[PDB]
Amino acid sequence: FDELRIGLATADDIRQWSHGEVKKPETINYRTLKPEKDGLFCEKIFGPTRDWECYCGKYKRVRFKGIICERCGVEVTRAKVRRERMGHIELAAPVTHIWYFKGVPSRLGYLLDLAPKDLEKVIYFAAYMITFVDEERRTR
């Protein structure tokens, strides 16, 4: 503990943090009460709900820890790992971080010299932009 460096989290960094990808909104099946596959709470991405106990029934013991069963993919380990591991969601279309915009001009910064009304009308799909022009080609 010497310095808590902080900064913008690029897409590559968030991918590196993630141990998988979240593809469904499922949380838990209404009958077995167990986390679903590839949704929220999934053990294949976050961790085993019980200590060293996988999902499909294959491994229930502490002896053979640190292994990945090919059936459900849950990596047997302590249940505490669920508190540490985190996932990510891949958006089909990019979006903007609400924090940096919609605020004072020390965080937004006028990095693009456009009024806040313009951004509000552009990022929420109410007006177009000219991202680039071949002005030299037009003049030629």
Q: Which of residues 2-41 bind another protein (CB under 8 A)?
A: 2-11, 13-15, 17-18, 22, 24-31, 33, 35-36, 40-41
Q: How many residues bind another protein (CB under 8 A)?
A: 83
Which one, 73 or 87, has the nearer CB to Zn ion? 73
Distances from the Cα of 58 to the Cα of 32, 69, 76, angstroms: 17, 7, 10
The 64-103 site mask, x for binding another protein (CB under 8 A), equals: ---------------xx-xxxxxxxxxxxxxxxxxxxxx-
CA pair distance 46, 42, nearest whole angstrom: 6
Q: Please report, as residue ranges, which positions from 110 to 139 form the binding site for another protein (by CB under 8 A).
A: 110-113, 119-134, 137-138
CA pair distance 72, 78, nearest whole angstrom: 17
Residue 54 is labelled as binding a ligand? yes
18 interacts with, out of another protein, Zn ion, none, CB within 5 to 8 A per kind: another protein
**Smallest distance, another protein to C-beta of residue 71, A:** 20
1 interacts with, out of Zn ion, another protein, none, CB within 5 to 8 A per kind: another protein
Residues 22/45, Cβ–Cβ less than 8 Å: yes
Burial tier of 54 (Cβ tally within 10 Å: 0-12, 13-18, 19+): buried
CB neighbourhood size of 26 (10 A): 15
- Name the binding residues for Zn(2+): 54, 56, 69, 72
